[PDB]
Enzyme design. Structure first.
Site, PDB file in Angstrom:
ATOM      1  N   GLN A  13       0.814  -1.213   0.000  1.00  0.00           N
ATOM      2  CA  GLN A  13       0.000   0.000   0.000  1.00  0.00           C
ATOM      3  C   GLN A  13       0.856   1.274   0.000  1.00  0.00           C
ATOM      4  O   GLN A  13       0.707   2.157  -0.863  1.00  0.00           O
ATOM      5  CB  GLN A  13      -0.949  -0.033   1.215  1.00  0.00           C
ATOM      6  CG  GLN A  13      -1.521   1.296   1.615  1.00  0.00           C
ATOM      7  CD  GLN A  13      -2.591   1.193   2.734  1.00  0.00           C
ATOM      8  OE1 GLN A  13      -3.685   1.716   2.582  1.00  0.00           O
ATOM      9  NE2 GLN A  13      -2.268   0.523   3.841  1.00  0.00           N
ATOM     10  N   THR A  14       1.712   1.431   1.009  1.00  0.00           N
ATOM     11  CA  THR A  14       2.593   2.593   1.033  1.00  0.00           C
ATOM     12  C   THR A  14       3.728   2.448   0.023  1.00  0.00           C
ATOM     13  O   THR A  14       4.100   3.426  -0.635  1.00  0.00           O
ATOM     14  CB  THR A  14       3.155   2.790   2.453  1.00  0.00           C
ATOM     15  OG1 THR A  14       2.088   2.793   3.388  1.00  0.00           O
ATOM     16  CG2 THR A  14       3.915   4.104   2.622  1.00  0.00           C
ATOM     17  N   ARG A  34       8.439 -10.082  -4.464  1.00  0.00           N
ATOM     18  CA  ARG A  34       8.207 -11.520  -4.514  1.00  0.00           C
ATOM     19  C   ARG A  34       7.669 -11.989  -5.863  1.00  0.00           C
ATOM     20  O   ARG A  34       7.824 -13.166  -6.189  1.00  0.00           O
ATOM     21  CB  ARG A  34       7.250 -11.945  -3.389  1.00  0.00           C
ATOM     22  CG  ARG A  34       7.906 -11.865  -1.989  1.00  0.00           C
ATOM     23  CD  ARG A  34       7.073 -12.521  -0.906  1.00  0.00           C
ATOM     24  NE  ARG A  34       5.853 -11.780  -0.629  1.00  0.00           N
ATOM     25  CZ  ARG A  34       5.038 -12.033   0.386  1.00  0.00           C
ATOM     26  NH1 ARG A  34       5.242 -13.056   1.202  1.00  0.00           N
ATOM     27  NH2 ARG A  34       3.978 -11.253   0.578  1.00  0.00           N
ATOM     28  N   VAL A  54      12.553 -11.397   1.064  1.00  0.00           N
ATOM     29  CA  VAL A  54      13.358 -10.732   2.068  1.00  0.00           C
ATOM     30  C   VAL A  54      13.891 -11.742   3.075  1.00  0.00           C
ATOM     31  O   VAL A  54      14.838 -11.437   3.817  1.00  0.00           O
ATOM     32  CB  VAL A  54      12.594  -9.607   2.797  1.00  0.00           C
ATOM     33  CG1 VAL A  54      11.676 -10.173   3.864  1.00  0.00           C
ATOM     34  CG2 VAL A  54      13.608  -8.619   3.386  1.00  0.00           C
ATOM     35  N   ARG A  77       0.420  -7.380   4.805  1.00  0.00           N
ATOM     36  CA  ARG A  77      -0.791  -7.122   4.059  1.00  0.00           C
ATOM     37  C   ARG A  77      -1.980  -7.173   5.013  1.00  0.00           C
ATOM     38  O   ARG A  77      -2.100  -6.317   5.897  1.00  0.00           O
ATOM     39  CB  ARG A  77      -0.848  -8.079   2.874  1.00  0.00           C
ATOM     40  CG  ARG A  77       0.211  -7.657   1.834  1.00  0.00           C
ATOM     41  CD  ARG A  77      -0.266  -7.905   0.428  1.00  0.00           C
ATOM     42  NE  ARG A  77       0.677  -7.440  -0.574  1.00  0.00           N
ATOM     43  CZ  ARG A  77       0.521  -6.338  -1.290  1.00  0.00           C
ATOM     44  NH1 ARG A  77      -0.481  -5.503  -1.075  1.00  0.00           N
ATOM     45  NH2 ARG A  77       1.367  -6.090  -2.282  1.00  0.00           N
ATOM     46  N   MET A  86       9.063  -9.553   9.312  1.00  0.00           N
ATOM     47  CA  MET A  86       9.602  -8.202   9.265  1.00  0.00           C
ATOM     48  C   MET A  86      10.894  -8.091  10.066  1.00  0.00           C
ATOM     49  O   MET A  86      11.848  -7.407   9.645  1.00  0.00           O
ATOM     50  CB  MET A  86       8.554  -7.207   9.769  1.00  0.00           C
ATOM     51  CG  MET A  86       7.344  -7.028   8.837  1.00  0.00           C
ATOM     52  SD  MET A  86       6.148  -5.844   9.571  1.00  0.00           S
ATOM     53  CE  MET A  86       5.519  -6.770  10.965  1.00  0.00           C
ATOM     54  N   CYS A 108       9.746   1.735   8.410  1.00  0.00           N
ATOM     55  CA  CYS A 108       8.399   1.915   8.941  1.00  0.00           C
ATOM     56  C   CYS A 108       8.034   0.784   9.897  1.00  0.00           C
ATOM     57  O   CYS A 108       8.104  -0.390   9.538  1.00  0.00           O
ATOM     58  CB  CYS A 108       7.396   2.008   7.804  1.00  0.00           C
ATOM     59  SG  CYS A 108       5.755   2.439   8.345  1.00  0.00           S
ATOM     60  N   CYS A 187      13.267  11.773   4.468  1.00  0.00           N
ATOM     61  CA  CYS A 187      14.292  11.338   5.387  1.00  0.00           C
ATOM     62  C   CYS A 187      15.595  10.967   4.697  1.00  0.00           C
ATOM     63  O   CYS A 187      16.602  10.792   5.384  1.00  0.00           O
ATOM     64  CB  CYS A 187      13.789  10.146   6.186  1.00  0.00           C
ATOM     65  SG  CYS A 187      12.509  10.572   7.413  1.00  0.00           S
TER      66      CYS A 187
END
Ligand code: NAP
Ligand code: A1ATI
EC number: 1.5.1.30
Length: 204
Positions: A13-14, A34, A54, A77, A86, A108, A187
């Site tokens: 999404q982001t 992926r 990842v 998701r 993560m 994030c 940033c």
């Protein structure tokens, strides 16, 4: 200045709007995805695509090689199950950054890391637990780490007018995905957020 970046989570999404804004800004963007089928087929697209996971250190190594900085927008998701994707992803990303001499990571997690722990919704605790583990990995890494901790991510427009609150909670509880991506990229242009927690928020 920063010119070559890797974005992890570019198909989310982001991620997707962060990828678009980064290519619009003139960045040379590498993505780890992926499936190439989840990237846009028209519009702003990345200069380099690595297809893999990842969770595979070799795939992360290929992505981080040669970059000036790294953006992390990994997530689950819609899945609220217990997970270590993560935090394990982050261990691989840190390892690769050190092997290659990349020193800047903008990542994030979530504003729940700034909340009273008795107030975090139990339904969201499983994901939050791995956000905490991922933040710990990045905090302890010694890299130039900007911890981006957004409240609710919405679908309001890009404004670039959000408030950035440091090392605490800010005055609004939403941030649009476009502004969150905008902030991630901001940033890269400054070191003044390095080592701090950052809460972007706005009233739409
Ligand atoms: N929703 C909210 O209101 C909210 C609030 C605060 C914080 N957050 C946190 O903000 C972060 C980003 O939110 P988001 O909604 O933009 O993320 P998202 O839509 O869930 O996108 C997740 C990204 O992670 C990638 N990914 C997941 N597992 C992977 C793996 N094993 N290998 C490689 N890539 C992998 C996905 O790739 P694929 O396309 O292959 O699935 C996708 O690009 C998340 O950590 C979320 O928990 C969300
Ligand atoms: C834990 C991530 C998450 C998810 C989610 C979605 C799909 C799959 C897995 C997780 N949804 N989601 C929300 O809807 C709102 C927040 C949030 C964070 C911090 C402060 C506030 C606030 O109310 O101030 C709200 N986090 C959040």
């Amino acid at each position: 200045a920063v010119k070559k970046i890797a974005i992890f989570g570019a198909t989310g999404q982001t991620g997707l709007t962060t990828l678009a804004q980064a290519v619009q800004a003139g960045y040379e963007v590498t993505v780890l995805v992926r499936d190439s089928s989840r990237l846009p087929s028209e519009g702003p697209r990345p200069a380099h695509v690595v297809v893999g996971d990842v969770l595979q250190a070799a795939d992360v190594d290929k992505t981080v090689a040669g970059q000036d900085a790294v953006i992390v927008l990994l997530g689950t998701r819609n899945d609220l199950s217990p997970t270590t994707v993560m935090s394990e992803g982050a261990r691989n990303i840190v390892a690769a950054m050190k092997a290659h001499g990349v020193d800047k990571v903008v990542a994030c997690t979530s504003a729940f890391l700034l909340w009273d722990p008795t107030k975090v919704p139990p339904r969201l605790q499983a994901v939050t637990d791995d956000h905490i583990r991922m933040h710990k990995v990045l905090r302890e890494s010694g890299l130039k780490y900007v911890a981006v901790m957004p409240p609710h991510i919405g679908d309001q427009p890009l404004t670039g007018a959000y408030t950035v609150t440091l090392d605490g909670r800010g005055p609004s509880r939403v941030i649009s995905k476009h502004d969150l991506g905008h902030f991630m990229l901001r940033c890269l242009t400054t070191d003044e957020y390095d080592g701090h927690s950052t809460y972007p928020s706005h009233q739409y």
